[model samples]
Target: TRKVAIYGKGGIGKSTTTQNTAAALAYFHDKKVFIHGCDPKADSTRLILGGKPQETLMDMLRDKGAEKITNDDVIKKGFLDIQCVESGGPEPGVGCAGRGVITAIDLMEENGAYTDDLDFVFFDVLGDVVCGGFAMPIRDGKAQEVYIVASGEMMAIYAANNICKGLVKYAKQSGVRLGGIICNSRKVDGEREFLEEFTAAIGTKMIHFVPRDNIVQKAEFNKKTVTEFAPEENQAKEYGELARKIIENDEFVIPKPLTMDQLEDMVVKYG
Candidate 1:
């Protein structure tokens, strides 16, 4: 199974992109996929499940206690039969969302959530904060590949670079590698080329550049991935292309994260 984690800045479309890509892989390629939502909001798998809320693992454990919980209670089958689970956030200031991620995944293991038939296991994590709790997935070896969903914006690139630093820290400890960068374009001028340059500076490739499109919003309005909502649309094809690239990709690396000065200079140079 290919265990992957998708990380990026908050509001940069990590959940949307991850869900759409997974939907493409499962719907078109007939792959068995599992998505674990590791965000406080627990919105990671919402699109896949048609916007119906899946009871979060942490919430379930807190309510029913571990003894009464089962895989069936936490795991919900979404579009294309994708298995989905959410590691809901802890109560404000009482606990850490990161620990919630750890607890949720551990509970999944105990309850046989990671089945052998799965071809892809995706972690749709929170923002680029990289707190110990947030880094649990990559640090503890649950996700072997990390794909950063970024845009051409400077802050987005900075977030991606920061994520690379985190990946570098855990690469040797766990067998995790930087799979590649996925640019969810915001249509900044020369975005595709600019993102390619940024990814190259970090010793990786811009695996796929998804063009800016309103169809994504259209699909999301209906609580669906582009592939499920309008497979004939160009946006759906973009996601399919991304999924295909991921399946065929083999160039995982321990990224050489650039310093702030270098990053800034590059941004200025790209301008």
Candidate 2:
């Protein structure tokens, strides 16, 4: 019954944080982990699946046509028996990746992609581009909880504000809530304070502050989550803790998305 979507500005380690967290959660479930990667780049599940790319739903839609496509055509098994699928879009600077997200999600829902037997389904989505389609996950009967991954960077916080703004519509219409933020550490000065202030402004809490660990990067060099790459590493403990936090989280709230000017004001105060 835990359905969540992860939104963040691109290049902020959302995918890495999410999948490693997923890998840790897999220890509790039996073939119940599913990662619905909403990125056009379609590399979201590479770490979980041993760096082998999953076929994106949109890619299959292009080759086989949507009417002819089946769930088996897009969904694939990854490491730890986790289910994986990517929502691929057109090449850069070309067609609409947003439309790709819409189409893929619709196809999944219509095809009964979500099953009661599944333990957790995470949508690793992009909020950098136009979030119209990115907001698809927050709409009725989808993800009820959302965790935004961000750092202390100005642009990251800016994008986070915009993302919450987009979610406001769905939140009002549905029961969705801002589950909390996952502050991915960038080792910046006043990072924790900045994130705390931003979350306070937005009416949310940071569920976890993932430490900036060299072991995480080292695992990525081999295309693996810290949990899967080196379960014995201390870095793995952090993701496990993050996973536990999200599961036991009770911080869901209707977010107070700020205006651009307000976001800047808060950043200046904490920055």
Candidate 3:
């Protein structure tokens, strides 16, 4: 099983980028893909699940104690037989959302969620790595590599830099490594170059730049991925290319997370 993670600032297209890439891998290469959403509201696998919402592991465990819940109760099959699970959390500002992530994953593992036949598993982690639970995927034996999605925007870059700190910290104690940055473009002038420089400064490459396209949004409204919505679209090919790069990626490294001052400098130069 290949375990990888994708993290980004809230609403920065992390889930969008992840779903499209997974769709490409499953649709084009016939690979078995699993997506675990580590965020609240649990809508990460919306497109692949044909827009239907999935119940979080914690929810089932809460309603029917962990001892009774079965794997079939939480894991849902979606497009191309992709396995989908979402780590749903409490109401806004109520319970510990991060803890929900850990609980969700724990149940999955207890229920034999990880199978040898899984070609790839993508964890679409919630907004910045804010707590131990959100960082759970990058820990010792979970995901061994992580791709932090970001845009050229300042806060997005800030989120990327902060996320690397967790990745580097985890890498020192585990096999986890920073795979690279995936720039989901905002299409600002020089944004692509800006992202490349940001990645360079942090000791990783810009793995791929997912160009801005309304079709992506359209696919979202249709509750499908670009690859699923129109596999032959030029936009769909970009996602396929991103998926291909992941299969070929060998540049994992313990990232050199930037200092606040260093990040500020880079942002000023590119922001």
**The candidate that achieves the highest TM-score relative to the unseen native structure:** 1
> Higher-lDDT candidate among 2 and 3?
3
Model 2 whole-model lDDT (C-alpha atoms):
0.82
Candidate 1 residue-wise lDDT, 210-260, digit = tens: 888998889889999999999988888888889999999999999999999
What are the TM-scores, per candidate, against the unseen true structure?
0.96, 0.92, 0.95
CA lDDT for candidate 3: 0.85
**Candidates by TM-score, descending order:** 1, 3, 2
For candidate 3, write residues 1-271 as lDDT tens digits.
8898888899999888988999999988889999999878588988999687787877787798877877788888888989999888877788677887788777778777878899999988885655767878877457888898899888998999888888777776778888889888888987888887778877999999889999998998888999989999988999999999999999998888788898888788875
Evaluated with lDDT, which candidate comes out highest? 1
Clashes in model 1: which pairs? 98-133
| Candidate 2 Cα deviation (angstroms), residue 151 | 0.5
Better of 2 and 3 by TM-score: 3
